[PDB]
Design an enzyme around this catalytic site. Sequence first.
Site, PDB file in Angstrom:
ATOM      1  N   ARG A 173      -9.737   5.655   3.091  1.00  0.00           N
ATOM      2  CA  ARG A 173     -11.117   5.528   3.533  1.00  0.00           C
ATOM      3  C   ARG A 173     -11.902   6.555   2.733  1.00  0.00           C
ATOM      4  O   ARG A 173     -11.456   7.671   2.647  1.00  0.00           O
ATOM      5  CB  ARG A 173     -11.212   5.738   5.057  1.00  0.00           C
ATOM      6  CG  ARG A 173     -10.527   4.604   5.885  1.00  0.00           C
ATOM      7  CD  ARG A 173     -10.072   5.045   7.304  1.00  0.00           C
ATOM      8  NE  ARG A 173      -8.980   4.243   7.932  1.00  0.00           N
ATOM      9  CZ  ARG A 173      -8.159   4.689   8.902  1.00  0.00           C
ATOM     10  NH1 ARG A 173      -8.259   5.938   9.366  1.00  0.00           N
ATOM     11  NH2 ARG A 173      -7.214   3.901   9.405  1.00  0.00           N
TER      12      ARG A 173
ATOM     13  N   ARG B 123     -14.169   9.012  -8.101  1.00  0.00           N
ATOM     14  CA  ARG B 123     -13.564   7.690  -8.015  1.00  0.00           C
ATOM     15  C   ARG B 123     -12.085   7.862  -8.294  1.00  0.00           C
ATOM     16  O   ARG B 123     -11.267   7.227  -7.639  1.00  0.00           O
ATOM     17  CB  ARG B 123     -14.237   6.718  -8.988  1.00  0.00           C
ATOM     18  CG  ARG B 123     -13.418   5.497  -9.373  1.00  0.00           C
ATOM     19  CD  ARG B 123     -14.273   4.415 -10.028  1.00  0.00           C
ATOM     20  NE  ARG B 123     -13.542   3.157 -10.184  1.00  0.00           N
ATOM     21  CZ  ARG B 123     -13.171   2.334  -9.184  1.00  0.00           C
ATOM     22  NH1 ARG B 123     -13.436   2.602  -7.890  1.00  0.00           N
ATOM     23  NH2 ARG B 123     -12.505   1.213  -9.484  1.00  0.00           N
TER      24      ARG B 123
ATOM     25  N   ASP C 235     -14.470 -13.990  -5.151  1.00  0.00           N
ATOM     26  CA  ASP C 235     -15.710 -13.923  -5.902  1.00  0.00           C
ATOM     27  C   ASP C 235     -16.107 -15.314  -6.326  1.00  0.00           C
ATOM     28  O   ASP C 235     -17.286 -15.673  -6.306  1.00  0.00           O
ATOM     29  CB  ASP C 235     -15.543 -13.068  -7.150  1.00  0.00           C
ATOM     30  CG  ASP C 235     -15.549 -11.599  -6.855  1.00  0.00           C
ATOM     31  OD1 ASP C 235     -15.801 -11.247  -5.683  1.00  0.00           O
ATOM     32  OD2 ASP C 235     -15.320 -10.807  -7.818  1.00  0.00           O
TER      33      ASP C 235
ATOM     34  N   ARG D  74     -17.440 -17.336  -3.539  1.00  0.00           N
ATOM     35  CA  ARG D  74     -18.819 -17.030  -3.271  1.00  0.00           C
ATOM     36  C   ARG D  74     -19.658 -17.732  -4.301  1.00  0.00           C
ATOM     37  O   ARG D  74     -20.736 -18.249  -4.012  1.00  0.00           O
ATOM     38  CB  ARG D  74     -19.066 -15.533  -3.368  1.00  0.00           C
ATOM     39  CG  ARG D  74     -18.707 -14.802  -2.102  1.00  0.00           C
ATOM     40  CD  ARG D  74     -18.838 -13.300  -2.226  1.00  0.00           C
ATOM     41  NE  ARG D  74     -18.853 -12.715  -0.884  1.00  0.00           N
ATOM     42  CZ  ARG D  74     -18.040 -11.750  -0.446  1.00  0.00           C
ATOM     43  NH1 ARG D  74     -17.158 -11.198  -1.255  1.00  0.00           N
ATOM     44  NH2 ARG D  74     -18.146 -11.296   0.817  1.00  0.00           N
TER      45      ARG D  74
ATOM     46  N   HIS E 240     -12.400  -7.454 -10.571  1.00  0.00           N
ATOM     47  CA  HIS E 240     -13.140  -7.636  -9.334  1.00  0.00           C
ATOM     48  C   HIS E 240     -14.237  -6.606  -9.245  1.00  0.00           C
ATOM     49  O   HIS E 240     -13.958  -5.431  -9.338  1.00  0.00           O
ATOM     50  CB  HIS E 240     -12.238  -7.526  -8.113  1.00  0.00           C
ATOM     51  CG  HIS E 240     -12.982  -7.600  -6.829  1.00  0.00           C
ATOM     52  ND1 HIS E 240     -13.949  -8.549  -6.586  1.00  0.00           N
ATOM     53  CD2 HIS E 240     -12.909  -6.848  -5.710  1.00  0.00           C
ATOM     54  CE1 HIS E 240     -14.445  -8.381  -5.373  1.00  0.00           C
ATOM     55  NE2 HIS E 240     -13.826  -7.355  -4.818  1.00  0.00           N
TER      56      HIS E 240
ATOM     57  N   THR F 144     -17.026  -6.548   5.393  1.00  0.00           N
ATOM     58  CA  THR F 144     -16.795  -7.982   5.352  1.00  0.00           C
ATOM     59  C   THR F 144     -15.418  -8.205   5.940  1.00  0.00           C
ATOM     60  O   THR F 144     -14.541  -7.380   5.775  1.00  0.00           O
ATOM     61  CB  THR F 144     -16.834  -8.514   3.917  1.00  0.00           C
ATOM     62  OG1 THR F 144     -15.674  -8.101   3.189  1.00  0.00           O
ATOM     63  CG2 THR F 144     -18.020  -7.957   3.244  1.00  0.00           C
TER      64      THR F 144
HETATM   65  C1  38Q Z   1       5.555  10.043   3.642  1.00  0.00           C
HETATM   66  O1  38Q Z   1       5.187   9.742   5.014  1.00  0.00           O
HETATM   67  C2  38Q Z   1       4.069   8.988   5.293  1.00  0.00           C
HETATM   68  N1  38Q Z   1       3.851   8.294   6.442  1.00  0.00           N
HETATM   69  C3  38Q Z   1       2.697   7.605   6.564  1.00  0.00           C
HETATM   70  C4  38Q Z   1       1.730   7.604   5.531  1.00  0.00           C
HETATM   71  C5  38Q Z   1       0.461   6.781   5.590  1.00  0.00           C
HETATM   72  C6  38Q Z   1      -0.740   7.199   5.027  1.00  0.00           C
HETATM   73  C7  38Q Z   1      -1.873   6.389   5.055  1.00  0.00           C
HETATM   74  C8  38Q Z   1      -1.834   5.108   5.614  1.00  0.00           C
HETATM   75  C9  38Q Z   1      -2.971   4.269   5.627  1.00  0.00           C
HETATM   76  N2  38Q Z   1      -4.176   4.851   5.306  1.00  0.00           N
HETATM   77  C10 38Q Z   1      -4.789   5.772   6.090  1.00  0.00           C
HETATM   78  C11 38Q Z   1      -4.457   6.149   7.366  1.00  0.00           C
HETATM   79  C12 38Q Z   1      -5.201   7.173   7.976  1.00  0.00           C
HETATM   80  C13 38Q Z   1      -6.252   7.829   7.317  1.00  0.00           C
HETATM   81  C14 38Q Z   1      -6.560   7.459   6.025  1.00  0.00           C
HETATM   82  C15 38Q Z   1      -7.687   8.101   5.289  1.00  0.00           C
HETATM   83  O2  38Q Z   1      -7.896   7.895   4.076  1.00  0.00           O
HETATM   84  O3  38Q Z   1      -8.444   8.811   5.944  1.00  0.00           O
HETATM   85  C16 38Q Z   1      -5.841   6.436   5.438  1.00  0.00           C
HETATM   86  C17 38Q Z   1      -2.852   2.997   6.229  1.00  0.00           C
HETATM   87  C18 38Q Z   1      -4.015   2.049   6.317  1.00  0.00           C
HETATM   88  N3  38Q Z   1      -4.085   1.156   7.289  1.00  0.00           N
HETATM   89  O4  38Q Z   1      -4.920   2.110   5.509  1.00  0.00           O
HETATM   90  C19 38Q Z   1      -1.622   2.600   6.734  1.00  0.00           C
HETATM   91  N4  38Q Z   1      -0.551   3.408   6.684  1.00  0.00           N
HETATM   92  C20 38Q Z   1      -0.626   4.653   6.144  1.00  0.00           C
HETATM   93  C21 38Q Z   1       0.502   5.485   6.119  1.00  0.00           C
HETATM   94  C22 38Q Z   1       2.028   8.315   4.364  1.00  0.00           C
HETATM   95  O5  38Q Z   1       1.226   8.398   3.241  1.00  0.00           O
HETATM   96  C23 38Q Z   1       1.506   9.337   2.177  1.00  0.00           C
HETATM   97  N5  38Q Z   1       3.171   8.983   4.307  1.00  0.00           N
END
Ligand code: 38Q
Lengths: 332, 332, 332, 331
Positions: free
Chosen positions: C98, C105, C165, C168, C192, C247
């Site tokens: 996020r 970037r 794309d 659309r 993209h 979206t």
């Molecule tokens: C090595 O152990 C471990 N365990 C879990 C994660 C991890 C990190 C980010 C994840 C992840 N992204 C995420 C989760 C929480 C916060 C954020 C952020 O960017 O703020 C991003 C997602 C998702 N739905 O986007 C889903 N699973 C994740 C899992 C991870 O990432 C290095 N590592």
Amino acid sequence: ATLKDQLIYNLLKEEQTPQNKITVVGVGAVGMACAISILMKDLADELALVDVIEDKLKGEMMDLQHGSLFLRTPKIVSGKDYNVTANSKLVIITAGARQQEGESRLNLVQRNVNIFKFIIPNVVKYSPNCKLLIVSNPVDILTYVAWKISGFPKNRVIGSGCNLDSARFRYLMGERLGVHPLSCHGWVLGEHGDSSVPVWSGMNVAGVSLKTLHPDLGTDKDKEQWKEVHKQVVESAYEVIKLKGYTSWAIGLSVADLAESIMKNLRRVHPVSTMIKGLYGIKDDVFLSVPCILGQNGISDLVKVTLTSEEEARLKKSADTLWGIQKELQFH
Amino acid sequence: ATLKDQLIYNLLKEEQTPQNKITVVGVGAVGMACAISILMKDLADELALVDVIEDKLKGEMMDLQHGSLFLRTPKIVSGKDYNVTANSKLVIITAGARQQEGESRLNLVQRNVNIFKFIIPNVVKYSPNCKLLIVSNPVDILTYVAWKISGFPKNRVIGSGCNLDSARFRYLMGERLGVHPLSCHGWVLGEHGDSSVPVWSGMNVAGVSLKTLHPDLGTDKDKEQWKEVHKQVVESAYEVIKLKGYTSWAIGLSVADLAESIMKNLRRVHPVSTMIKGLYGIKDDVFLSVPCILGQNGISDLVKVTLTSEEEARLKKSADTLWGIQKELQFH
Amino acid sequence: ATLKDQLIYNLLKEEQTPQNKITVVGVGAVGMACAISILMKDLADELALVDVIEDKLKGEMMDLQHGSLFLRTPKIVSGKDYNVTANSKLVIITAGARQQEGESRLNLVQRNVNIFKFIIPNVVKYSPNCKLLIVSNPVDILTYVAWKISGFPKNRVIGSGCNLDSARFRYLMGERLGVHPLSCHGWVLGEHGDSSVPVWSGMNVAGVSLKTLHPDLGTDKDKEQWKEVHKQVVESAYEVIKLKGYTSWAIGLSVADLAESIMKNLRRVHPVSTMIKGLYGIKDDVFLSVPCILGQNGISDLVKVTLTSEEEARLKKSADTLWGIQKELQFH
Amino acid sequence: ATLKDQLIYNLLKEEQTPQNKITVVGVGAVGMACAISILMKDLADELALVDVIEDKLKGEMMDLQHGSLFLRTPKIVSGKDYNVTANSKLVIITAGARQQEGESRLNLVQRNVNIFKFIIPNVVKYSPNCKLLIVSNPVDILTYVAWKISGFPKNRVIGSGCNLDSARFRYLMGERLGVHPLSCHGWVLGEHGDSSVPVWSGMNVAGVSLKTLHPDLGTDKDKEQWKEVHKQVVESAYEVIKLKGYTSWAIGLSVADLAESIMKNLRRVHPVSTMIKGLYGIKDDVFLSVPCILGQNGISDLVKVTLTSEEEARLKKSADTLWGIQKELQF
Ligand SMILES: COc1ncc(-c2ccc3c(Nc4cccc(C(=O)O)c4)c(C(N)=O)cnc3c2)c(OC)n1
Ligand SMILES: COc1ncc(-c2ccc3c(Nc4cccc(C(=O)O)c4)c(C(N)=O)cnc3c2)c(OC)n1
Ligand SMILES: COc1ncc(-c2ccc3c(Nc4cccc(C(=O)O)c4)c(C(N)=O)cnc3c2)c(OC)n1
Ligand SMILES: COc1ncc(-c2ccc3c(Nc4cccc(C(=O)O)c4)c(C(N)=O)cnc3c2)c(OC)n1
């Protein structure tokens, strides 16, 4: 530099076998009605057609092929040689012996047996892990035949059975009540055909039992002669044959449904013809129709339904009758 | 009360008028293929079959109904009297006159005229806002016949034209390129016949012109002999019929595709047969296949394909021929 | 014996091997929007959600599960643990980083690498034969990422790319013409986003080149400013985000379509992001969208659209842009 | 010569009322799951989105529009004016008051009322022949409220009621049994929510009663505690909420299904909140869920369920309770 190349760069030669294939043996009316119903319920990624009427087969394959664009089944095939069935998930047998004028029930069965001695070994040769769905009539006997010969385990040899009769039964229960057959609930079990058992107890709408509300239901004193709904269900194929030559549309849809629960592993309950030795005091290798959980392993479980002392004794005779034929067949 | 009545309080009995009805005329293979196809795309809330063979008709009605449980189309009816066609949105004519060994092209069309003199004004008497789809052959001329007899405007009278012819052209394109026919594009236009015009200018995949890529395409010196694809398009009903007796499944699937766009108001472009006096130097009340925008009032507009002089001549000659036949019909 | 065992007699010990299993990584708006559109297109016999947010994940799973009655997908599972993804055919990744106001970037990209470092080998640990569909953004980089991390051959790693794309583009094209997007054809290729290339040459309806017809199409002298149809395409994502915050629905349907093609082996041509090192004078290790044929083997072949040396120039400059970012990413 | 001119020869137009148009009021998660769920089952040819948040409305509309290529529902239109809803065969209401920390039952429904004197009148104004499907929030009352304000025949005002509750019960029944929900039957009827009645008698598979096979089913002295399944049914929406925030997916598919029955005239039977002045003691104008046949005319008939005096007298009290609120309202 052919055009197919100028236009497309290949990444990958690989690929051999298909994932969710269905074979339909015999391309009669029933055969194709299964075939079109399966095509349009998007249930298979390859569909194989087999028969011995070489030129007919090729025609039905072509006619279907040409409607490709309007379908999500990308490969259709045919052949008199069973190698085209290779790796089928499900294999539907509509093929059999056409009745002769003088012919005894036994002879018809036997000639079906001698046909099944060519078909069934070829099906399992090429698709050893397939589920076998038998539509051919007399279906409860031919299911036995194809069980014996395949040596598939009972869970992988399923008869079209009473899946259609129950479908008719509900259609007609619906007509009376002003309700869709989906909301009308009823079961025709046992021998597919003349002596099937319409289970009046288990009839209901929204769960309010018809038999409870109308105690006289399913019987001779039945002011409302609901026993005649059963008779329509039995007279059905005939009065349709007498009218148009054959049945095909409902049988096709009925089978299509069955293949759906098998193909998508839905674990729905249909009444199909299956090896009910042991159940209901029946002691012989005899197939009868009974509500079964179909899924990717074919029949995984079956529902023990409560039959009367009366309704039980029907199935008994159906199966004594059945074994009475079955034991005079010749396999060697 | 009855059983019906102790289980079902009635809030109100009401005159339903059907909301998305589709009539199919003639229950031959093409007849029923169109109906089974339509039934399974759920495009209508009421199907009506109509023919003159009551026993055959009625068999088909019942055999459809008997898998009503497997369908989401609650009223199916059939009758020989065109009141069963009441309020149809789209009426589909597969019916016609059966050719007679030595019969002439024109005489055949005239018996067709006579039949349409009965069928059509009955259809319009009971569904005066309907769209007419003519599936019956010779399509392009019989579409003119039903227009002339119905008094309908050119947009509500539509010929199944080359909608199928093009679907074949794309299947075939497909099997050569190794690409699904959804993604291979090509247009067969003009007379649904031998005279049908394969528009090479248009053949693409992913919008890359096959003509600019391999300019011999569709010409006698074309080493890949792409012209054969069209020949195969033209000779298919023949090859299929020779092999299986009739054709049905593709034409059925094709018609249901039109039914979709019409019934669902989609405004897709299909190559159907419509009035094209004015376009491509055509001067007379003739019908041919041209990409049309289809929706709920039938043909709303039609795409102006650019054509080579030769292709334009083909169409003109097509029209010359058809006017030739049309001009010695007799209506009153 | 319990009620269950009374009612149901079982026959087989359910191995429980899942056939057409799909997994969805990330239960975002996009993640569910894929899940729901896949469930409604009957494309799986088992769906699996996986995210780190556990209370959330379980909730989404339980809700989908509650509509189980209206779906034909008998097994929906969820988990923090990637062990639930096992035996997936297709693993669709939406997860990602996020964005943080002020972040470069490159870092955003890198943070995404850093969670694919955990996700991807967990996905391939349990489903070594699966197809990866990358939906996460930036999608052509994170495809290179997943590809490198997975070590899957290039055909089993696919970017969501410019599939949407073009949908659309087609949508908008249809707006103007008054035609369904189905019958309006046009391809948006490359990276993209802001630099994606509208390929005017290949725009058509019915086989007719708009570009030939109106040769100004998509320059700036273009009296009709058709170039805006592109800009609207690129700025559509933003514009919806400004109005509802994200979206979800279109990207959902778009992914369900890619899935359909893969899971059903349709070999329809989609413009998805694949490795194009070799074409368009690109010699890096870059992913860009190009029209690809999509099968059970993922990207099996790919179409060689002819580009104007201008269109080629953008594609090349996209690939540098992209490699220069990619070559700075830490991986081990 | 525009490009259009050169490409498309144009035939004469005739007018074009939309033919199977559904409008959804309220573009909250429920509204939108209803929207997408209907779009994917091809039940309409026009879909109309209406709410008061207008930025959100147009964003949800554009987003659905961009997926047009993957749908067969060629008009999606949205707006803050109820003229976008004109000629809707079916109009589905989700809009309504949102209960506050402080609020009581009676104040929250009095507000729902006031919001409904804006919306309901407007819906009929432009589609006088619609079927109102009320999903609202506190249903068996708001359905009443739509009915009263629209002035429509009881049959054309249908509450989702326990349609969803039953599907959740069938899922769960499903679970224990090893059987798909389609093949598991059981019914939750009456006051959606805490008071919903699971008709144990009617629970079956293949027509074999469970109450008859295991006579302590659903009673307190039940060894495998089947009452817990029905606890769980009321618990779930109020438990997923706990877990995810709102409920959407299941409610959407539930509504979609009722839409399919309505729009295609299936005369399938569905437990929906309809006006049961006449049954179970209830000599009161109340809506509660009982199994009903949904045609194209709305609720055309219904099923008279035989009920334990326990079950009868819960509905009886459900209906007392509801009239006790409803009577204190004003229009
Ligand atoms: C090595 O152990 C471990 N365990 C879990 C994660 C991890 C990190 C980010 C994840 C992840 N992204 C995420 C989760 C929480 C916060 C954020 C952020 O960017 O703020 C991003 C997602 C998702 N739905 O986007 C889903 N699973 C994740 C899992 C991870 O990432 C290095 N590592
Ligand atoms: C020597 O190998 C060999 N090869 C083929 C057959 C054989 C015989 C009958 C077959 C068969 N039925 C068939 C063929 C000829 C006549 C009859 C009849 O009605 O009596 C029935 C079908 C079908 N579609 O029903 C399909 N395949 C068949 C195949 C066969 O014998 C059963 N044996
Ligand atoms: C004015 O009275 C009247 N009534 C009925 C008919 C009539 C004639 C032929 C019909 C007809 N075809 C048909 C019927 C009889 C013979 C033939 C033939 O070509 O041999 C063809 C069809 C059909 N399925 O093709 C369907 N309806 C028909 C209806 C008719 O024909 C002009 N006229
Ligand atoms: C008299 O003019 C007028 N104009 C608009 C409304 C009105 C009121 C409430 C509405 C309504 N409910 C709503 C709107 C705003 C806040 C709340 C709340 O209780 O917090 C509830 C919804 C919805 N999505 O639930 C949608 N449209 C509405 C529209 C209205 O009703 C009071 N009256």
